[PDB]
Paper text:
Here, we have determined the crystal structure of the antigen binding fragment (Fab) of anti-SCH antibody JoJ48C11, both in the apo form and in complex with the oligosaccharide laminarihexaose. The JoJ48C11 Fab fragment adopts the expected heterodimeric structure of a heavy chain fragment and a light chain both consisting of a constant (C) and a variable (V) immunoglobulin (Ig) domain. The Ig domains show the typical immunoglobulin fold characterized by two anti-parallel β-sheets packed against each other. The model is consistent with experimental data and validates our previous hypothesis about the specificity of JoJ48C11 towards SCH and other similar β-(1,6)-branched β-(1,3)-D-glucans, namely that the β-(1,6)-bound D-glucose residues in conjunction with the triple-helical structure constitute the binding epitope for the antibody JoJ48C11.
For understanding of the molecular determinants that contribute to the recognition of SCH by JoJ48C11, we aimed at obtaining the crystal structure of a complex with SCH but failed despite extensive attempts. Therefore, we resorted to structure determination of a complex with the less complex oligosaccharide laminarihexaose, which is a β-(1,3)-linked unbranched glucose hexamer. Electron density for two glucose moieties was observed when crystals were soaked with high concentration of the ligand (50 mM laminarihexaose) for one week. Interestingly, laminarihexaose does not show binding to JoJ48C11 in an in vitro affinity assay, indicating that this is a good example for the sensitivity of protein crystallography to detect lower affinity. The JoJ48C11 Fab/laminarihexaose structure was refined to 2.4 Å resolution. In the complex, Asp105H of the heavy chain CDR3 region binds the O4- and O6-atoms of the non-reducing end of laminarihexaose in a bidentate fashion. To confirm the observed interaction of Asp105H, we generated an alanine mutant and produced it as scFv-Fc. Binding of JoJ48C11-Asp105AlaH scFv-Fc to SCH was completely abrogated in a titration ELISA, which corroborates the importance of Asp105H and the significance of the JoJ48C11 Fab/laminarihexaose complex crystal structure. Subsequent mutagenesis studies proved His35H, Trp47H, Trp100H and Trp90L to be necessary for binding SCH, since their respective alanine mutants showed significant decrease of binding strength with EC50 values of 1.1 nM to 10.9 nM, which are higher than 0.6 nM (3 times the EC50 value of wild type JoJ48C11 scFv-Fc). It is important to note that the main interaction sites predicted by docking are different from the position identified in the crystal structure with laminarihexaose, suggesting that JoJ48C11 may contain two separated recognition motives for β-(1-6)-linked glucose moieties.
Numbering used by the authors:
A (entry chain A): 1 to 220
B (entry chain B): 1 to 217
The structure:
């Protein structure tokens, strides 16, 4: 019923600016202060500031006074946040939330911001080949390494989606290069290695690259 | 600013177990709020004014405390209570949040299945070598994964990635990726991944010699 709709993900370069929105419905937009919070993985939650949409008054965390600018438009029931002079430390998920006064417990779905000087690039897909080094007794492991792509996300399936059991697709890691990398692995019965074929369908479409790589039982 | 320290940072609880997490404040606060965040979703107000449950929060949840010491308690742990809980104060400006307590499901110990993957011929052609070590379906999360290249312990050239707790068997899976230049890779022979974990009576090693594995060279 009550809804806080935040604008879609944003990609920006260092030193650029970005402005994000937070559309409120299901409650009196003017009766609640709109707070903004920043979340990075491995970090907690950071309170940026709030705006009173009724009066336009804003308070800021001193840590974000020169970084964030909070606006509100009553006629559209929309609060806005602008972030200037962007650095890699500004890459995060940003939530809007009517934290005060009490009464509305919901937050917005969040806006993900990634700021990076990296260029769009499709991944290279390398096989993680099964063999004796990848076999316990009757179970063998194989996979695909999805390396050196930008930006998030990539989608990986196995045998066009026919194989889901035992699939582990790890979270992407941002390498020092500025490109992302992950591996997707699957465990299968070792007897089926030389008889049944395993192909991973790796997809990253900001670069519109789609690759299916056959992972094959290599001999050690 | 008032600094909020939540303890423990990560904890695991069995079904039906009583669980208590603490939120400590660097200076006295009069009230404490609590938010629940499930993975990949937004936080939601869970407890307000120290002890008042938000609407729709089940009765097994409670909060208490005063001064510099507050806590959130679940009388009987249930699977849907797995989440991260953040405390927050506003007796002082600016309002501050704790770093969260990640509450996960405790299950029996399960030893990891370990697999090592030598680099593909395609990537060696491109001039880099990635060696991947896989720890599959284990519990608890803590695991020591050491890379040794001709008995030399590696540092700063590997990175770990861990899945979320599996929805069905509550295990984790982990990948350790050792990244080397093709030049350094061909300068050594033995590449080993050694895994120490509570579920192994002794550490397990998966290794290969660059050369007992067929390749382009
Ligand atoms: O926001 C805290 C609580 O305030 C009360 O006024 C509302 O009835 C609840 O829905 C809400 O959970």
């Amino acid at each position: 019923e009550v809804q806080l709709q935040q604008s879609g993900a944003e990609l920006a370069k260092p030193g650029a600016s970005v402005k994000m929105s937070c559309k409120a419905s299901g409650y009196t937009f003017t009766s609640y202060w709109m707070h903004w919070v920043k979340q990075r993985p491995g970090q907690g939650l950071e309170w940026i500031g709030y705006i009173n949409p009724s009066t336009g008054y804003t308070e800021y965390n001193q840590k974000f006074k020169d970084k964030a600018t909070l606006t509100a438009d009553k006629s559209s029931s929309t609060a806005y946040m602008q972030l200037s002079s962007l650095t890699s430390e500004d890459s995060a998920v940003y939530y809007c939330a009517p934290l005060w006064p009490l009464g509305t417990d919901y937050w917005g779905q969040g806006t993900t911001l990634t700021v990076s000087s990296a260029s769009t690039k499709g991944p290279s897909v390398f096989p993680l080949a099964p063999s004796s080094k990848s076999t316990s007794g009757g179970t063998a492991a194989l996979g695909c390494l999805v390396k050196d792509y930008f930006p998030e996300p990539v989608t990986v399936s196995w045998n066009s989606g026919a194989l889901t059991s035992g699939v582990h697709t790890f979270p992407a890691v941002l390498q020092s290069s500025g490109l992302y990398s992950l591996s997707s692995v699957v465990t299968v019965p070792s007897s089926s290695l030389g008889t049944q074929t395993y192909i991973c369908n790796v997809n990253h479409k900001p670069s519109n690259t789609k690759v299916d790589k056959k992972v094959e039982p290599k001999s050690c | 600013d008032i600094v909020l320290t939540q303890s423990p940072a990560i904890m695991s609880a069995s079904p039906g177990e009583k669980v208590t997490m603490t939120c400590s404040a660097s200076s006295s606060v009069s009230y404490m709020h609590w938010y629940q965040q499930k993975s990949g979703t937004s936080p939601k107000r869970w407890i307000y004014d120290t002890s008042k449950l938000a609407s729709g929060v089940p009765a097994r949840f409670s909060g208490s405390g005063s001064g510099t010491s507050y806590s959130l308690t679940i009388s009987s742990m249930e699977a849907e209570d797995a989440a991260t809980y953040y405390c927050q104060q506003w007796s002082s400006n600016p309002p501050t949040f704790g770093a969260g307590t990640k509450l996960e499901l405790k299950r029996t110990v399960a030893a990891p299945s370990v697999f090592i993957f030598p680099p593909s011929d395609e990537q060696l052609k491109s001039g880099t070598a990635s060696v991947v070590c896989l720890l599959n379906n284990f519990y608890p999360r803590e695991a020591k994964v050491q890379w040794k290249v001709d008995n030399a312990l590696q540092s700063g050239n590997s990175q770990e990635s861990v899945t979320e707790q599996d929805s069905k068997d509550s295990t984790y899976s982990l990948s350790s990726t050792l990244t080397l230049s093709k030049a350094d890779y061909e300068k050594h022979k033995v590449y080993a991944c050694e895994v120490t974990h509570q579920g192994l009576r002794s550490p397990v090693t998966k290794s290969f010699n660059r050369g007992e594995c067929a390749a382009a060279h």
